[PDB]
Paper text:
Here, we describe the discovery of a LysR type transcriptional regulator (LTTR), AccR (for ACCase regulator) in S. oneidensis, which directly and specifically activates transcription of the accS gene as a canonical LTTR. Like other LTTRs, AccR is predicted to form a N-terminal winged helix-turn-helix (wHTH) DNA-binding domain (DBD) and a C-terminal EBD (also called regulatory domain, RD) that are connected by a linker made of an extended helix and a flexible hinge. We showed that AccR interacts with the accS promoter in vivo in response to changes in acetyl-CoA levels and in vitro. Multiple lines of evidence indicate that acetyl-CoA is one of the effectors.
Despite numerous trials, we were not able to obtain any crystal hits for the full-length AccR. EBD crystals were rod-shaped, belonging to the space group C2. An EBD dimer was found in each asymmetric unit, with the two subunits arranged in an antiparallel manner. The final structural model of AccR EBD contains residues 89–302 for subunit A and residues 90–300 for the subunit B, except for residues 132–136 and 206–207 in two surface loops of the subunit B that are structurally disordered. Superimposition of the two EBD subunits in a dimer gave an overall r.m.s.d. of 0.25 Å for 204 common Cα atoms, suggesting nearly identical conformation. In the AccR EBD dimer, ∼3200 Å2 of surface area is buried at the dimer interface, which is mostly mediated by α5, β4 with α7 and β10 from the adjacent subunit, suggesting stable molecular interactions. This funnel-shaped pocket, which runs through the entire molecule, is 25 Å by 20 Å wide near its opening, with most of the surface being neutral to positively charged. In addition, another ‘secondary’ pocket is found at the regulatory domain dimerization interface and contains S103 and E105 from both chains of the dimer. However, this secondary pocket found in AccR may not interact with acetyl-CoA because it is a negatively charged cavity as seen by the surface charge representation, and acetyl-CoA is also negatively charged.
Numbering used by the authors:
A (entry chain B): 90 to 132, 137 to 205, 208 to 300
B (entry chain A): 89 to 302
Write the structure that this text describes.
């Protein structure tokens, strides 16, 4: 396992988390050089693109890496001031904190009871760090990973709402070219990535 | 009146935690502003339906933009004691080409640092062990002994004071870097824009816990 590995990762991934992962990877494989770009471009000479599902027709070779379960939450202060929405249709009268890029719409798919609803777009940002802080700071309703916020849920700083209409889990994949189907550095990296996001101190985002 | 929407573009290398704290404070002061904040390294427009503000590192190179200096930092070259104990300490810039560097950069950034005794800087190359567009990852990898890194002496104050990072080549410093908020001249109505940029400086400069973030 050697050579160079150029990897694209959405801006919504935690840079702290990916840093810890790449450190452990390089410790195991000392002869690999890394070029990691946090970017929201739809992938430019990349060996691996990390992507959220669903995969597109251009994604001809891919590996499922992990899944996460989002949940809708707000702070108790927000719910005291604005009320607790009783059904998804009431989200239209509520402030939401949208995780998205410059063409992402303030629409959330809820239920399985399956429906798509809008909300007042108080903030749009492509940073989960900022989404979480703004939710804690009483600004409105946010979709957060149930694993990313277990402490805040346990201590009541975030409150789950509309639990009768759960969201579909999201899946994360690694996409790579069939030209590199035999590449040992790609396989080594994705194996290490899967082990971290499945059994580790890394299940925090 | 400060109200309506503000759209802000920010480099991917910029602290998301710092921006989150400042945006929370801004919206608590101005409850009628809706924010659209995008961390991006793409070229973005500053007119019409494009962005209202871009946060940009120096140098400024464009007329038709107005700029407000948000803060300035002094980068220094550092490595961990563990790195230096095994690879040796470079004595001159010429020796850096034999050393591992952790490069902060995007897809066209070269593995060079401009170093110089005085104002005149010269390109100094290193082995590109890592390139990444994240100061957080750069710092962690330097702390974990993977190579030499350019780091802000503010972001790394604690690690320098206690020895987990060690400055090198101190006789060939780098230029400071400067962080601006920029907006279009061809765009007037800068009530919300000026309110944001001046709140940024007022809150950043009075909160020590924020100054450590970059």
């Amino acid at each position: 396992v050697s050579g160079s590995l150029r990897i694209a990762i959405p801006v919504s991934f935690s840079q702290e988390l990916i840093a810890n992962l790449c450190s452990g990877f390089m410790r195991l494989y000392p002869n690999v050089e890394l070029d990691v770009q946090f970017t929201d471009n739809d992938i430019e000479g990349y060996d691996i693109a990390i992507k959220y599902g669903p995969l597109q027709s251009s994604d001809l070779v891919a590996r499922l890496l992990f899944e996460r379960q989002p949940i809708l939450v707000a702070s108790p202060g927000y719910l005291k001031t604005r009320g607790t929405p009783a059904t998804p249709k009431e989200l239209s009268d509520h402030s939401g904190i949208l995780l998205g890029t410059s063409r992402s719409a303030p629409i959330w798919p809820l239920g399985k009871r399956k429906t798509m609803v809008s909300f007042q777009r108080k903030v749009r940002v492509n940073s989960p760090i900022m989404v979480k802080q703004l939710a804690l700071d009483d600004f409105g309703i946010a979709m957060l990973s149930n694993s990313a916020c277990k402490t805040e849920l346990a201590n009541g700083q975030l409150v789950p709402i509309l639990q009768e209409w759960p969201m579909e889990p999201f899946k994360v994949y690694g996409v790579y070219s069939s030209r590199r189907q035999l590449a040992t550095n790609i396989s080594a990296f994705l194996d290490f990535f899967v082990k971290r996001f499945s059994s580790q101190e890394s299940l925090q985002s």
